Amino acid sequence: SLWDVEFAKQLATVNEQPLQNGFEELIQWTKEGKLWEFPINNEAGFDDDGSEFHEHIFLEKHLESFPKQGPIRHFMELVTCGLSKNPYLSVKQKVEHIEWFRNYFNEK
Amino acid sequence: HYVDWRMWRDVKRRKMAYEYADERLRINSLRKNTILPKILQDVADEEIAALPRDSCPVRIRNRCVMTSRPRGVKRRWRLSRIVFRHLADHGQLSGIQRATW
Amino acid sequence: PVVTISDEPDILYKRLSVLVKGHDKAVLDSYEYFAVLAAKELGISIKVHEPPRKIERFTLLQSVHIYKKHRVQYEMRTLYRCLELEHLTGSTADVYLEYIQRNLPEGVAMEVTKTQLEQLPE
Amino acid sequence: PLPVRMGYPVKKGVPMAKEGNLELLKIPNFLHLTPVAIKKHCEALKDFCTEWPAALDSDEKCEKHFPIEIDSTDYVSSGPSVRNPRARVVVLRVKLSSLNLDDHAKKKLIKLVGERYCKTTDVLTIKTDRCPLRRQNYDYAVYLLTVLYHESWNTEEWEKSK
Amino acid sequence: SEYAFRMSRLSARLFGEVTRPTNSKSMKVVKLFSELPLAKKKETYDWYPNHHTYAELMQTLRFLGLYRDEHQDFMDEQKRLKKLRGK
Amino acid sequence: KNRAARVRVSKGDKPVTYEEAHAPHYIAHRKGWLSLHTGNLDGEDHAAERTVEDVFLRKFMWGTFPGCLADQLVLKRRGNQLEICAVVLRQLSPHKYYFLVGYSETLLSYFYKCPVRLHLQTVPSKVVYKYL
Structure with missing residues (x-):
């Protein structure tokens, strides 16, 4: 398949939109990611994963409530509220934080 | 590979305070508190009192790069007024001018 | 156009609130004039004026070593132009902002476009 | 090809150099695209002519519709960085007055939210910005509002005495 | 108020937030445990570049013959002169 | 007095440019701004990193050409476009010019993830302000 690869390279070199013009260079920049995804919608990045509009807040069940006899449950609820009010976190991050908190608190 | 030394001291202190993130995080979050038990508060107190220098998160003093000056510095440009004034005098900053009101 | 003709419903856009920010007066004037010209060519009734300026004159001395009886400041004659488009579609506004950003004024004259959707409640 | 003179005079003569000047470069630079090129670009952008509804402005009928x-x-x-932590802004500014279908929920919603419920126009703007995005944030806000409305449809037993 | 407390408890049970009230000194701990503390500010590790990788890049560029190091070369020459005069 | 960037009278036919002859109280009056970057803006934030990047780019471009940059550059950020307006002087041949320009352009475009390009200042007269 030597001739096949040769023809493939010839195609990728010629048929592909070459330069020879300023508009062609602009198109090459836009395709190679050199230029921002105009219009700058701030979508090309900063996704922070998904939430499915029901994962970051619904934390009532996922709590692991210590025997209700002290302020530990209230503190955990406050921590969950603070995490939900912070839009700079994800599901896995919040889960790991809650797990580490519960551990460091009631390891025993 | 800096020229001065105060810049390197600040770099080392800031990076040591940033690296040991969890330790100082828990310490500052649990030490001074009137709620919750005091066992963990005393644990954090002992941890912060027994550990050596170059780790405490209280090592943040605004300084510049061109001079490494702590007196009069802003977080907006991470440089001092002198460096800002030196750059403005050369017309290398937009919008900066004399107080014409 | 060359944007894959679809048949799905679009989002109801309303009010493309814009706010230019800069320092130089002539640059902001040129930017707002070009924006108004492009908007009029597109055919969108809008209004333009001048909101209050925002200047936080930071503090600094006049010399470098030692001087207090003679102080100085570094302010700016910044201006703002709210080139808001009252009620329009999202695709046209997006193409307009794309054409703008393809050659926006460096540094000064930075726009802060803002839309206001609607959609159905429940 | 425009020998434009730029510079401050010395005493009593003519501005400095002729061709490219430092000031000319310091200008934000708009020499590109002349009025003719501007008209050409406008004719190019003539595409995209989506219709818009005439729902009457005045910030009344627009809110009544939605x-x-x-x-x-x-x-x-x-x-050179596109990551701009600023596209996550979202607010569910729903006009409760436009709804106007609360038999007993009037006494429930007034208390289930603190910094809301006005007098002239009920601006129920529950800043729902808990998730790390915008569209799913609005979806969750709408879902929570629907759940709250469904729960208020059957008010509690001790909600009358306030 | 008792009625206000019961209403807040009911809302928290429905919404899914903090229920009973207490001292407001827990917000600081919540922020320090979840949000940014103090040393992890946006202008700390970036306040000063390590200048190690940058210095190596500048040295490589100088070796390639496409850069200039005036202060460094002058200091090296002065050090060589001092050593010749030294020590 | 104040000699922030000015040069008092001395001779008559001495070398001097626009940036090498201006007062501190004329930064924006009789003199322009050599850096219309997206840093020192208001009410917009982000200024430290922008100024650092501008200084780095200016120093790199000054170090590129050996003995041909009298005044600083005029960076322009049109979103994702880095336009350079250097005060370059005719050095030698055009082959070396094109080679170095292309090399620097490709290097900066592959490093900063943003297209970069410069243009020489082919003018047979500097921007002399005061005759001095």
């Missing part, structure tokens, strides 16, 4: 008013902007970024 009370919710989400904000989905697209700020411009600076430097």
Whole structure:
């Protein structure tokens, strides 16, 4: 398949939109990611994963409530509220934080 | 590979305070508190009192790069007024001018 | 156009609130004039004026070593132009902002476009 | 090809150099695209002519049709980085007055929210910005509002005495 | 108020937030445990560049013959002169 | 007095440019701004990193050409475009010019993830302000 690869390279070199013009260079920049995804919608990045509009807040069940006899449950609820009010976190991050908190608190 | 030394001291202190993130995080979050038990508060107190220098998160003093000056510095440009004034005098900053009101 | 003709419903856009920010007066004037010209060519009734300026004159001395009886400041004659488009579609506004950003004024004259959707409640 | 003179005079003569001047470069630079090229670009952009509804302005009928008013902007970024932590703004500014279908929920919603419920126009703007995005934030806000309305449809037993 | 407390408890049970009230000194701990503390500010590790990788890049560029190091070369020459005069 | 960037009278036919002859109280009056970057803006934030990047780019471009940059550059950020307006002087041949320009352009475009390009200042007269 030597001739096949040769023809493939010839195609990728010629048929592909070459330069020879300023508009062609602009198109090459836009395709190679050199230029921002105009219009700058701030979508090309900063996704922070998904939430499915029901994962970051619904934390009532996922709590692991210590025997209700002290302020530990209230503190955990406050921590969950603070995490939900912070839009700079994800599901896995919040889960790991809650797990580490519960551990460091009631390891025993 | 800096020229001065105060810049390197600040770099080392800031990076040591940033690296040991969890330790100082828990310490500052649990030490001074009137709620919750005091066992963990005393644990954090002992941890912060027994550990050596170059780790405490209280090592943040605004300084510049061109001079490494702590007196009069802003977080907006991470440089001092002198460096800002030196750059403005050369017309290398937009919008900066004399107080014409 | 060359944007894959679809048949799905679009989002109801309303009010493309814009706010230019800069320092130089002539640059902001040129930017707002070009924006108004492009908007009029597109055919969108809008209004333009001048909101209050925002200047936080930071503090600094006049010399470098030692001087207090003679102080100085570094302010700016910044201006703002709210080139808001009252009620329009999202695709046209997006193409307009794309054409703008393809050659926006460096540094000064930075726009802060803002839309206001609607959609159905429940 | 425009020998434009730029510079401050010395005493009593003519500005400095003729061709490229330092000031000319310091200008934000708009020499590109002349009025003719501007008209050409406008004729190119003539495409995209989506119709718009004439629902009467005045900030009344527009809200009556759809009370919710989400904000989905697209700020411009600076430097060579496109990551602009500013596209997550979202507010569910729904006009409760436009709804006007609360038999006993009038006494429930007034208390289930603190910094809301006005007098002239009920601006129920529950800043729902808990998730790390915008569209799913608005979806969760709408779901929570629907759940709250369904729960208020069957008011509690001790909600009358306030 | 008792009625206000019961209403807040009911809302928290429905919404899914903090229920009973207490001292407001827990917000600081919540922020320090979840949000940014103090040393992890946006202008700390970036306040000063390490200048190690940058210095190596500048040295490589100088070796390639496409850069200039005036201060460094002058200091090296002065050090060589001092050593010749030294020590 | 104040000699922030000015040069008092001395001779008559001495070398001097626009940036090498201005007062501190004329930064924006009789003199322009050599850096219309997206840093020192208001009410917009982000200024430290922008100024650092501008200084780095200016120093790199000054170090590129050996003995041909009298005044600083005029960076322009049109979103994702880095336009350079250097005060370059005719050095030698055009082959070396094109080679170095292309090399620097490709290097900066592959490093900063943003297209970069410069243009020489082919003018047979500097921007002399005061005759001095």
